[PDB]
Design a protein around this ligand. Sequence first.
Ligand SMILES: [Zn+2]
Lengths: 67, 97, 131, 152, 13, 50, 97, 100, 211, 32, 106
Amino acid sequence: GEILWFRGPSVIVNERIINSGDPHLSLPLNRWFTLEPDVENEKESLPGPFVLGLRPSAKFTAHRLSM
Amino acid sequence: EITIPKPRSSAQLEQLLYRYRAIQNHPKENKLEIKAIEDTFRNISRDQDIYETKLDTLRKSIDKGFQYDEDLLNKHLVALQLLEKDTDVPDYFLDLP
Amino acid sequence: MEYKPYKLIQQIYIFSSKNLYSQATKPLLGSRPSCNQNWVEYIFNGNELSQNENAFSFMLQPMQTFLTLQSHLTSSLKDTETLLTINKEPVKSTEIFDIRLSEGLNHLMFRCEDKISHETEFMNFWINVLP
Amino acid sequence: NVKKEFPVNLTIKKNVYDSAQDFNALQDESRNSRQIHKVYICHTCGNESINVRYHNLRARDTNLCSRCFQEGHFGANFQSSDFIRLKKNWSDQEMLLLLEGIEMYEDQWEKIADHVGGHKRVEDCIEKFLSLPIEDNYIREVVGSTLNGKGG
Amino acid sequence: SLPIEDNYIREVV
Amino acid sequence: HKVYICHTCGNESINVRYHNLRARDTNLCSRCFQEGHFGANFQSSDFIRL
Amino acid sequence: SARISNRINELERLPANLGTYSLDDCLEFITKDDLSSRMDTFKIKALVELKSLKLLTKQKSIRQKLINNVASQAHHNIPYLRDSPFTAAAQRSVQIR
Amino acid sequence: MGYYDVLAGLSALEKSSQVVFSATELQQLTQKRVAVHGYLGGKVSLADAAQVEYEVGHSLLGSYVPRQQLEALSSVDFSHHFHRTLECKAALETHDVFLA
Amino acid sequence: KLVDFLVNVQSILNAASVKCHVVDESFPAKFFEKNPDKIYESYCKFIKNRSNSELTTINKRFENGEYEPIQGGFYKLYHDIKLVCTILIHFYPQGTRNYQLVDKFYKFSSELLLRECCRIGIALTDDDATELDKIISYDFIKISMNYTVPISQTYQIRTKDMDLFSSIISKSNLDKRPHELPNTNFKINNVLPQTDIENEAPRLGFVGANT
Amino acid sequence: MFETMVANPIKVSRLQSNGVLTGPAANTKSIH
Amino acid sequence: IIKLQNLYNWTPSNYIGDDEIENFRNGTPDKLVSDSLLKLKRLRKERILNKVLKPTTEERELYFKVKRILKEVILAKKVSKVPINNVRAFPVLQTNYNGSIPVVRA
Ligand SMILES: [Zn+2]
């Protein structure tokens, strides 16, 4: 029962799986629908990193729980 | 002529549109890629309209009371899958049905 | 422990070198451009931090070797500032320093002293440059 | 005093004819010109947290190559007004929702299209279902049933 | 007993 | 039974080990894999859960 | 050989980070920190198929060793071959002092 | 090589508008077995094997990598290497042809 | 939707708390605020009053029909979850089994509620200083994406030979206890999460090489 | 403080890392 | 003239032929599907006998045709039941981080 000391600080990864297809991640070519930096720049505040990861719906979890 | 070939897939059409959107603002300089791109776009829109009309005619003249047998549909699904992913369909799988 | 927000230091920035960016975006009519092109930036606010937790860690890709550190000071008086790399001493060119890290693990100790009120503030940075 | 066959790992292989239908993990981000990445990530270690700001980059120098489609871009050779004034490929969340819908609603395609989201039509769901890989045990069973029906 | 090569032998012949 | 030991900390791995696909001799704990406590020339894709 | 080389090429052009979402992870209430107990199921299958395709000649060699060492002893281990008058006559003819 | 390949290359890099094709450019863009090993039979002379040309091709790290060397490689460098050779090759080839 | 949603959420929370019993714990059942980021604090105040002037679980609030399909009911559920989790975190020891069980349950339930509420259109609630930012904003147009995530901590020491670090500390993000350095000379290092999302990886033939 | 201490690193042999077999039947030179 | 409504909405599988319309109106599309699958298999065998990997254009067209026929058959509810056999998983990428313990490099 003694503390183990490593030569390097640990690593934190938020999501273990990523949405390989996503307008947030994979920016599409030919954006179809919508001095100073620019007018066309847009920011999006995600409600959390879970938007970039794969999560099941509550409905399917409940369905599987019913059996 | 030049006659830019028909795009093989949708990504090729997207890159055609990107190239056109890049070229637009120098027409007096390019003057030749624009016309071929536009002929290709015309052919594509024509084909899309023809496809829409043919699909409309198809879905409204299918049949009154025909149905597809389940065994044959299952065999066809499995064979389509196998052929799609480069595997092999045994010889006794389609001739006999 | 306790909670001690900073008073002298304010908004330390550590970002990628402008020269690396210029050489990755403009090839000087010579070679090919790179393929990674990842440029980072790390901002640290004087307030809303703690002087009892003054260490920070992050990793960098092997090409992100040249960094630059920009410091702002709330104390509008004359203060003494020293940046220490792996225990050498870089010299500045509001202050701006250019750092060239080494492969492995690097330690940056940024120190401010007031010398009027005689207050010291430290910021430690552990950085990993992967092989 | 049966022929056990090597597994047909269909989920691993790729589509031979139209490779634009593989799972996003198997596709090559080189036909849509997405190989080279231009990223800019700004952190802020303010208050026991970090406000990650992720930025994708597009060349501001390129005129009409990184800007949204608008009516003033196309000339008299186009009929784009109504279309511009008023998705197309799948994702991983949408694929997961499709699998879950098939698992819950077997063939009720409308409930499935509602479970996926308002972006996909019924036809797209039917296409994706047709292109999904099937189990290996079922393939062995079907092929062996045909073989036994031929040989007996 | 491992059908490593059976598929290709079968599809060629 | 059989006993496996993490290559980084002496503690033994329980119920699961992360086999290195390149070293083929060094296995890791679940925690030492979660926190990236392996060498700096290995990536997380070099290990497999067994 | 062409088909085998093509399959090996396709297998090697796969990504290393090849996790799999198993749709049964619902009952395992993963909290973004736990590790899914089925992330490596397509990776394991890909590795198995690749390595089995790369160890083909080894299996061939062991198979031919087995076959040769079981054929050379046909007349001594198989009854209806050992008991024919011709094999017995030949084995006697060899041992004539 | 191919017109759409040239377009994909010029679009990978963001310097697609800095290129102009000529007439000719457009018109041209539209178009025995020696036993090596001995695991199965009696090996032929090593000189004969050397006389033949080997081509694996399908594998990435060749047909053999020693245990220690592979065990002690760097994954980041090889990931970048594969990204340069396998995926970004067309863009670099176009940059070699055009863009001076 | 919202009716079936509440039914599913109740079933899921009942199923996920078999080991933690978080749903079967009793809190004062008369406490409520508006901004969640202060709940614990306010609760403390509450305690003091009702501690010097000297009821229900979550399942009981479900069966009595206390959460309405409006934003009010969802916020009540989120609030009660966070409250019971804070209570049980400050109750159990720092690193025991039930502590981390409660922490895991809180993470799961909070993420579930957030994702689900965002799926039904409900919510529960700048680059000028650096020349790098200047040249980037001059050269490229920036399509942005912002999110926040807490950072972790570890212990760090210096010896005759080298600098050494500890494992990540499993202290929950709800733990408000100030700190307790097990020994002096322990420095507290702040570990920052990983930035890249589409971080590349080598091919499969690289890890399946022939030796 | 802590400047005069030494590391005492933890060494693990690969034989110990993958292939230790245990129990009373661990060694063959045992009646058990 | 050009319509962006068509450029945005187009796929290489949008080339319905008269054979489909006839084999639908006259019933029995299944015969067309079976014959097309036989033709696909024969073309693939010929593609294997001489070493060539890329399928020809006609193979892509037959594949697209079979997919469209089956899609329109299922959509029109012209089948009693649909067989549902799917691998209940699917491949997905996975984050890839590096080790933090630095290299000794003897
Ligand atoms: Zn360990």
